[PDB]
Design an enzyme around this catalytic site. Structure first.
Site, PDB file in Angstrom:
ATOM      1  CB  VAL A  43      37.166  24.972  48.770  1.00  0.00           C
ATOM      2  CG1 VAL A  43      35.995  24.007  48.993  1.00  0.00           C
ATOM      3  CG2 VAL A  43      37.347  25.252  47.350  1.00  0.00           C
ATOM      4  CE  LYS A  45      36.036  36.758  50.930  1.00  0.00           C
ATOM      5  NZ  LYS A  45      35.207  37.149  49.750  1.00  0.00           N
ATOM      6  N   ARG A  47      42.227  38.059  47.716  1.00  0.00           N
ATOM      7  CA  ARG A  47      42.110  39.305  46.972  1.00  0.00           C
ATOM      8  C   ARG A  47      41.623  39.051  45.546  1.00  0.00           C
ATOM      9  CE1 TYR A  48      40.390  33.195  44.963  1.00  0.00           C
ATOM     10  CE2 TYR A  48      42.620  33.361  45.779  1.00  0.00           C
ATOM     11  CZ  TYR A  48      41.397  32.741  45.792  1.00  0.00           C
ATOM     12  OH  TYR A  48      41.211  31.654  46.633  1.00  0.00           O
ATOM     13  N   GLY A  49      39.251  36.937  44.733  1.00  0.00           N
ATOM     14  CA  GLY A  49      37.869  36.429  44.738  1.00  0.00           C
ATOM     15  C   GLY A  49      37.731  35.140  45.535  1.00  0.00           C
ATOM     16  CD  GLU A  50      33.269  34.338  47.087  1.00  0.00           C
ATOM     17  OE1 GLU A  50      33.512  35.071  48.090  1.00  0.00           O
ATOM     18  OE2 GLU A  50      32.105  33.948  46.794  1.00  0.00           O
ATOM     19  CB  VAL A  51      38.099  28.393  44.669  1.00  0.00           C
ATOM     20  CG1 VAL A  51      37.770  27.100  43.906  1.00  0.00           C
ATOM     21  CG2 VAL A  51      39.317  29.118  44.040  1.00  0.00           C
ATOM     22  CE  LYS A  64      41.112  32.860  40.896  1.00  0.00           C
ATOM     23  NZ  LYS A  64      42.503  32.957  40.371  1.00  0.00           N
ATOM     24  CG  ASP A 162      51.221  35.269  41.370  1.00  0.00           C
ATOM     25  OD1 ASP A 162      52.114  35.378  42.258  1.00  0.00           O
ATOM     26  OD2 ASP A 162      50.035  35.514  41.590  1.00  0.00           O
TER      27      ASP A 162
END
Ligand SMILES: c1cc(-c2cnn3cc(-c4ccc(OCCN5CCCCC5)cc4)cnc23)ccn1
Lengths: 312, 107
Positions: A43, A45, A47-51, A64, A162
């Site tokens: 659901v 995506k 630079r941090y990765g994906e949820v 996450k 942030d």
């Protein structure tokens, strides 16, 4: 398959306060639940990765899965929630953290099916009541992060660093909750678009905790502006835009921002149609007091919450 | 890997096998004795199924070596626990762990 004695997550989260026992599930339980989750659909995506939306024993969770580029966010977010009792209805509810096994890092939380405020604002307009409810709840969550509370049940002051509409989720009841404490400090760098002038020109007093709180306040003012644009008055509403959309490109550089905010001293423009609605006239005034170049002059989170509570 | 010190006997006959749910009470501590978690503090037994990798490796081998009713003290080295990484803000890097574990029941 279900047995006598099984608990839901609400039960598992509830029997979990002896001082030092964290915001999430009991520490040894986190792994077992982590490894019993079925991942279902991606659901988000970045630079941090994906949820992912996942399920555990018939319940939705958000997982996450951090990208290798952002492991320090996993460590810090996990450390913050495990070290501190951070439970508040406008802060994303942490459940568990786990690393699997060449290695995946997971942070598991409550799942919010409405998604991020950023997406929410693009897909809908708001009325007086729903606009205030959104910005008040963010103010409340943020005031709770910022406040030091003592005792066996307590928490230190926390700055987020942030804050942005992408790191705010919308709840079904129409309030929001702040997510993503991967950069938080307790008493990777912020998203550039939302950096306060003192960060952009690196004059931030980096060993005064209040400096980081005032960085949160700047960002919070930008989010208010984003949200207020989408409240209809006399049939009129602005299209969703991010802050500084007209003077910096997408994915702005640290330099692009510094020129706009610090050298030219620019601030997001206040639409004149707002001055004919009492709530947006008040939100206008709130915004501007979040954007002083002198960080000391800026409103506190508790004051914004107070001011927003009176508009009603 | 993992040491098993028996504190009180089980039946000495019923040992958990693949696909059994072990119901235990536990108190987990660091090497110096600092408690970081206990299912006794909340009076809710902890359950896990053997052979699914639901727990750290030391727990899985250690409890597999216990028989129903038995209380035992598990000393688990970091390679069989949370490794280099630990569990941030709770288990430090390179932690030896001591778990006081009672095998209540199998399911
Ligand atoms: C940050 C955020 C989260 C998080 C918790 N809930 N949650 C929910 C979402 C979310 C984001 C977008 C959503 O859109 C739903 C519809 N889309 C349609 C297209 C692709 C599948 C889903 C639904 C949920 C995103 N992130 C989170 C968890 C951890 N860290």
């Amino acid at each position: 398959t279900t047995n006598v004695g099984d608990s839901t997550l609400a039960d598992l989260l509830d029997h979990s306060c002896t001082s030092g026992s964290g915001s999430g599930l009991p520490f040894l339980v986190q792994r077992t639940v982590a490894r019993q989750i079925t991942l279902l659909e991606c659901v988000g995506k970045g630079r941090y990765g994906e949820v992912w939306r996942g399920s555990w024993q018939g319940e939705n969770v958000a997982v996450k899965i951090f990208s290798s580029r952002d492991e320090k966010s996993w460590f810090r977010e996990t450390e913050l929630y495990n070290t501190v009792m951070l439970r508040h209805e406008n802060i994303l509810g942490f459940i568990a953290s786990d690393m699997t096994s060449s290695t995946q890092l997971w942070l598991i939380t409550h799942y919010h099916e409405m998604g991020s405020l950023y997406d929410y604002l693009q897909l809908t307009t708001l009325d007086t009541v729903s606009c205030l409810r959104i910005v008040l709840s963010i103010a409340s969550g943020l005031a709770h992060l910022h406040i030091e509370i003592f005792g066996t049940q307590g928490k230190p002051a926390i700055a987020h660093r942030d804050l942005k509409s992408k790191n705010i989720l919308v709840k079904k009841n129409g309030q929001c909750c702040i997510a993503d404490l991967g950069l938080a400090v307790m008493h990777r760098v912020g998203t550039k678009r939302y950096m306060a002038p003192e960060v952009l020109d690196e004059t931030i007093q980096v060993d005064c905790f209040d400096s980081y709180k005032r960085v949160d306040i700047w960002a919070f003012g930008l989010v208010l502006w984003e949200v207020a644009r989408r409240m209809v008055s006399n049939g009129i509403v602005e299209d969703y835009k991010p802050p500084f959309y007209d003077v910096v490109p997408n994915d702005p550089s640290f330099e692009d921002m510094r020129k706009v905010v610090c050298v030219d001293q620019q601030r997001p423009n206040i639409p004149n149609r707002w001055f004919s609605d009492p709530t947006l006239t008040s939100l206008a005034k709130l915004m501007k007091e979040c954007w002083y170049q002198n960080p000391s002059a800026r409103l506190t989170a508790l004051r914004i919450k107070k001011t927003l509570t009176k508009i009603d | 890997g993992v040491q098993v010190e028996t504190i009180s006997p089980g039946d000495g006959r019923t040992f958990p096998k693949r696909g059994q749910t072990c119901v235990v009470h536990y108190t987990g501590m660091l090497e110096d004795g600092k408690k970081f978690d206990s299912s006794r503090d909340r009076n809710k037994p902890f359950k896990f199924m053997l052979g699914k990798q639901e727990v750290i490796r030391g727990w899985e081998e250690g409890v597999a070596q216990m028989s129903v009713g038995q209380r035992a003290k598990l000393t688990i080295s970091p390679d069989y626990a949370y490794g280099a990484t630990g569990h941030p803000g709770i288990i430090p890097p390179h932690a030896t762990l001591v778990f006081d574990v009672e095998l209540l029941k199998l399911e």
